Amino acid sequence: TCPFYKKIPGTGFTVDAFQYGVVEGCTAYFLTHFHSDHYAGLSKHFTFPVYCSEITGNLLKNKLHVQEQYIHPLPLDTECIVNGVKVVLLDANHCPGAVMILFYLPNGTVILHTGDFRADPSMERSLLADQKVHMLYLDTTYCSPEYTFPSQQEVIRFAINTAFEAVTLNPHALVVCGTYSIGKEKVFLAIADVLGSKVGMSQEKYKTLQCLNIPEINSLITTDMCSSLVHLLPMMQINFKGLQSHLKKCGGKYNQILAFRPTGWTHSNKFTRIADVIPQTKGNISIYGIPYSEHSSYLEMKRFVQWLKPQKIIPTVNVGTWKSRSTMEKYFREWKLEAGY
Ligand code: NI
Incomplete structure (x- = not known):
């Protein structure tokens, strides 16, 4: 069954959620990037709508043989309506075709899902500059100062x-x-x-x-x-x-x-x-x-989050141990106090 941190509340949407069979209530399945831990489950037998970048779409079609009628590529940096909700895809500075996803929820909440990313100051001048983010689903791979x-x-x-x-x-x-x-x-x-x-x-x-x-x-x-x-x-x-x-x-x-x-x-x-x-x-x-x-390095990650000032952070990496979760929440509270949000 699908964990909470891959579901997008108030939508029919999931992110990188192909290994759980038919997810109840899911009308559209997003895929951030073509890495195996994220696409695990997709194949030529998949029959639900997949939303992703053009490059991720070429890989699905040619390497996994997903049928064309189910692949929905979206251009980057462009406001798109999917099943009645506005979304935008942003370059994640990860591997080719990797994106972050901005969702503009019907109730006024704004969510950013980073997928996997390498945070860069150039992201501070994308469409993120325009507005507030209530929830951040963060790639926390290297969320410790030794990294x-x-x-x-x-x-x-x-x-x-x-x-x-x-x-x-x-x-x-x-x-x-x-x-x-x-x-x-x-x-x-x-x-x-x-x-x-x-x-x-x-x-x-x-x-x-x-x-x-x-x-x-x-x-x-x-x-x-x-x-x-x-x-x-x-x-x-x-x-x-x-x-x-x-x-x-x-x-x-x-x-x-x-x-x-x-x-x-x-x-x-x-x-x-x-x-x-x-x-x-x-x-x-x-x-x-x-x-x-x-x-992201630890310093790159910290700089991006301090800039974005999200109201809540949900990690997507290192979530399996109490000690990891605890370590990550301590860093997020330090970042917030130091910066004043
Ligand atoms: Ni990856």
Whole structure:
């Protein structure tokens, strides 16, 4: 059965609620983004209206085979009426096609559901600036002050320079990048661009990337592995065993692998600056773990909430333990007292 924090009161609506069968009273099912914990349940047999972005719609249709008659794409930054209620979709600065949803309830209440987001000061000049928000359903993934990490821009700079240096010293090195879902595409795109190569990958991954409306994509990616010196592999294969094995397959073209594992936060963030990061190395293989986050840091989250000044906050992440819930409510009360709302 569907938990309370995925229901929108006073509407027939749910958010990211596909794993509970037919939800009683639900006339429209919203999907914030194409990540498996959120779409869990959807398939070609689904027969209720799905509301989402254009990109999320391309993924539903081509990867999960949802029939076209049930996919309702909405443009961003545009007031839309759905089953008699005004809604707006806002870019969430998460993965491609990820949105936040503003609902304008018939009784005058205004609700913002962030889905998964990486809060940015540029959100303070969207359609959020115009008006008041009574309830916030918040992505609280990293709602604790230990969670620090650099900007996405600093992380990409480190990856581009690392890769360019290696391959310039050794033109026979191959670069490999791990992936398990959409998001974080800039890692492998930025590296391929500095090296003047396409990104090589499996047919299934190429399919997924073709659904994302990335400009000039046919110029950037390929299924011909042999022509490419940046390859993508599943994240599970980014280890000394998996990579030795991949190197065997390349037919005596390369004599070194440099690989990148984009992760979220890891404890080595509590001591080490991005500039000071070093790989794990076995022979002619080196692996860099790099902290490329598509979720708010603690400071980014705090700044957004202090700016928005919501009357009530409902977390959507880390809700399963008493200690987590208690920790989150303490931070929300500090933020409110410090800022005066
Ligand atoms: Ni996500």
